[PDB]
Design a protein around this ligand. Structure first.
Ligand SMILES: [Cl-]
Lengths: 242, 242
């Protein structure tokens, strides 16, 4: 059963923002959120789509492994970290659109769409075009749908090989210490109103896993750090992390 | 190739300690240590043996996956984290000897030596006999030999399945942040003099990986934190980590 907890709103209020955090306790099969309505609002995935994109690239052998280097094409771009060679680990880490655009062109439009459908990943909206779709059809996904997808990935239940899912979860590694491990992917949807920032993944504990998906209004990039900040604030409140 | 950097001795000296740090630059295929003689001294591996032990258990089906629970046997031991159910992840995190003894029980001495020999992990295995011979399956291994075995694991070149090696590499996840990822295993050999503490593994960077292996005289359990602290001071000094 889903349970709503407005007390989390204070963490959004504090930084003068608007959003939703969704948490799923895997042991208890119970969800929590500050807003069930927006928890179920579908938005563009932005770079959270790189999780299934990576699964598909690995499963088709377009990416051999997390070590294969994809060379910089020489065009310089506004994100300095993109102007360098990358492997799957660092392409995830820095959300390198040109690397993923080259994956997408090797995979194929139609296969991409089919294989995202096989994931139950958001809802139809299939164009376009090749490799960056939305415009006459952009997959949208709600935060709870992100949890549902992430749960299958965690349990290796998706319609791709087990190796593919293992390597993507390695590449999603964001933080680890003696208390918790976070595997997650950020996203920032700018090219259609309303601008929103994403953070989706899970926290592994010794004896439990907490899946989370959050999105929030992001009129400018000044607030991007708040994606992790507000999430951790909520994770601290619910005593998931210290 | 193998440079001796005696300026690292200051990091043991600082703590009135005695030991060796070994580093391997994977990109440059070049190694560094403060003591070439100690770097090649074979010690009992203690809990660093749990890295190859885990590979063997997975490859044989003794451990089905990283989620299989291994129930506590009801006998309380001195270390509180041992007195609970464990899976592969938490067993390695707290170095739970009763769990690994049950792995060894199912593997048997004979297969353990065949496989350790196939890994070229240290020297002697089952044939270990006479004088002090019952410990750590008769293995003695040096810090440079730890590096050799870790490099094979990193590259999935050991003679067990790729899946086995990927699962074990997940299980050694110790620390991760925006600057690096450490995969490693501690060890503390106490049943034979001189007592020594181990820390072995590697540091993943965007663009390189640095393998490390350190051991150090450890009279009392008081100074086990020095294993990581001295290592990190070498890593900081060499500008591997901030
Ligand atoms: Cl990992």
């Amino acid at each position: 059963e889903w349970q709503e907890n407005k007390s989390w709103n204070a963490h959004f209020t504090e930084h003068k923002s608007q959003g939703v955090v969704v948490l799923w306790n895997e042991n208890k099969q119970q969800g929590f959120t500050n807003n069930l309505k927006r928890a179920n609002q579908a938005f563009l995935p932005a770079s959270t789509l790189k999780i299934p994109n990576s699964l598909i690239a690995l499963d088709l052998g377009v990416v051999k492994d997390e070590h294969q280097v994809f060379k910089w094409d020489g065009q310089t771009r506004d994100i300095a970290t993109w102007n360098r060679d990358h492997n799957l680990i660092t392409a995830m880490k820095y959300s390198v659109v040109p690397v993923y655009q080259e994956f997408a062109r090797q995979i194929g439009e139609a296969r991409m769409s089919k294989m995202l459908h096989a994931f139950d990943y958001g809802n139809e909206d299939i164009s376009g075009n090749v490799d960056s779709f939305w415009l006459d059809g952009g997959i949208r996904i709600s935060a709870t749908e992100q949890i549902s997808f992430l749960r299958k990935l965690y349990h290796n239940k998706l319609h791709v090989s087990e190796r593919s899912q293992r390597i993507v979860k390695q590449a999603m590694l964001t933080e680890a210490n003696g208390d918790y491990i976070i595997r997650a992917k950020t996203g920032y949807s700018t090219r259609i109103e309303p601008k929103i920032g994403w953070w989706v993944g899970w926290v592994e504990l010794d004896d439990n896993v907490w899946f989370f998906a959050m999105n929030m209004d992001m009129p400018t990039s000044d607030g991007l750090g708040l994606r992790q900040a507000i999430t951790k604030e909520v994770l601290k409140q619910e005593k998931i992390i210290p």
